[PDB]
Amino acid sequence: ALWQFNGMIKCKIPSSEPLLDFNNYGCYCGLGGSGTPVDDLDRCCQTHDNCYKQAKKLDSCKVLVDNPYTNNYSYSCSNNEITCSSENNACEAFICNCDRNAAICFSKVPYNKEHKNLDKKNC
Amino acid sequence: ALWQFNGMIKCKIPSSEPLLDFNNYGCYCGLGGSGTPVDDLDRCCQTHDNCYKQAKKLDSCKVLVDNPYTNNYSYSCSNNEITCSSENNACEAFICNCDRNAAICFSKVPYNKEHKNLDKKNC
Ligand SMILES: [Ca+2]
Ligand SMILES: [Ca+2]
């Protein structure tokens, strides 16, 4: 779910509030996403969107009435490392992995303030 | 909470259902507990009971209306290792630690079937 992803990002980037800093950035970071990523952070978001689209195709994911942003899973942050738990059932484990890769992606690319609240007509 | 503790035990002892195997064992494993522990597993339970009693004394724990068995926290099981998450606020982190020490204790001591559903008059 959205609250775990928020925690995963804070695990890698302790100085940020992800829901404020990364929401509505470029063409992909945020609800939906279309067009060409405007930069590397936006591209992290695009990969994350694709990952969630893949999860939806899974037989296991389609058995639970739960949106990826509400489907809770278990993970831990220890010494700024993210660990998805083995207690996670197949769907939740796929989602946890998507979220983990994105948090790490986010922390490795440049943040361009010019792309915050990007005019969706650039997409 | 009780469901995380159940998962922590299964993390260290994958062959068991903790709620069935360890509930009502000796004088301490289970709701309450008095008397002298009948063995080492029962003593793990006693330490766990004391840990939960300590948690209750904490200023931070006393601010939340939540029983230790309902107060959810975050942890992960990876390659049979338990890791309490840094996302845990003070109370939850104390409780997570109590639970982790007990799961590990459980997995290191003998299990005596004679003490299952011990007649509470031995306590
Ligand atoms: Ca998106
Ligand atoms: Ca007890």
Side-chain angles (χ1 to χ4, degrees):
Chain A
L2 194 50
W3 310 126
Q4 277 102 47
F5 188 25
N6 169 77
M8 288 198 174
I9 305 178
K10 284 158 148 283
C11 181
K12 307 304 288 193
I13 310 169
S15 52
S16 92
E17 300 292 349
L19 254 335
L20 293 319
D21 294 330
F22 296 90
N23 194 28
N24 243 95
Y25 181 100
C27 295
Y28 287 82
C29 307
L31 208 68
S34 55
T36 303
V38 299
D39 63 6
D40 292 331
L41 178 39
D42 199 23
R43 194 162 283 267
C44 289
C45 290
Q46 183 195 37
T47 302
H48 188 240
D49 281 12
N50 290 335
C51 202
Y52 272 19
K53 288 157 192 156
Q54 191 77 158
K56 269 137 67 63
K57 301 281 184 284
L58 307 179
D59 294 306
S60 320
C61 283
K62 290 183 276 62
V63 81
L64 53 77
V65 61
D66 238 344
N67 160 45
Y69 288 109
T70 320
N71 198 23
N72 284 264
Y73 57 74
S74 292
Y75 81 95
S76 67
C77 175
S78 178
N79 262 90
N80 310 105
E81 204 226 305
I82 301 162
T83 302
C84 284
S85 187
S86 58
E87 246 62 89
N88 289 148
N89 287 153
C91 188
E92 293 101 328
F94 186 83
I95 293 303
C96 187
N97 190 62
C98 289
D99 285 351
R100 177 173 187 269
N101 292 348
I104 295 159
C105 192
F106 284 9
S107 72
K108 282 290 144 91
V109 298
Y111 185 86
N112 287 290
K113 289 125 306 303
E114 295 88 324
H115 304 319
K116 263 295 294 172
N117 304 122
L118 198 253
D119 342 318
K120 301 288 296 184
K121 210 146 190 189
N122 286 109
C123 310
Chain B
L2 194 50
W3 310 126
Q4 277 102 47
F5 188 25
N6 169 77
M8 288 198 174
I9 305 178
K10 284 158 148 283
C11 181
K12 307 304 288 193
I13 310 169
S15 52
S16 92
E17 300 292 349
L19 254 335
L20 293 319
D21 294 330
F22 296 90
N23 194 28
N24 243 95
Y25 181 100
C27 295
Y28 287 82
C29 307
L31 208 68
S34 55
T36 303
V38 299
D39 63 6
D40 292 331
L41 178 39
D42 199 23
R43 194 162 283 267
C44 289
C45 290
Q46 183 195 37
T47 302
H48 188 240
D49 281 12
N50 290 335
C51 202
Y52 272 19
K53 288 157 192 156
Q54 191 77 158
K56 269 137 67 63
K57 301 281 184 284
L58 307 179
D59 294 306
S60 320
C61 283
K62 290 183 276 62
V63 81
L64 53 77
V65 61
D66 238 344
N67 160 45
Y69 288 109
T70 320
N71 198 23
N72 284 264
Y73 57 74
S74 292
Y75 81 95
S76 67
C77 175
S78 178
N79 262 90
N80 310 105
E81 204 226 305
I82 301 162
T83 302
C84 284
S85 187
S86 58
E87 246 62 89
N88 289 148
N89 287 153
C91 188
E92 293 101 328
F94 186 83
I95 293 303
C96 187
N97 190 62
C98 289
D99 285 351
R100 177 173 187 269
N101 292 348
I104 295 159
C105 192
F106 284 9
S107 72
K108 282 290 144 91
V109 298
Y111 185 86
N112 287 290
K113 289 125 306 303
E114 295 88 324
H115 304 319
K116 263 295 294 172
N117 304 122
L118 198 253
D119 342 318
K120 301 288 296 184
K121 210 146 190 189
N122 286 109
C123 310

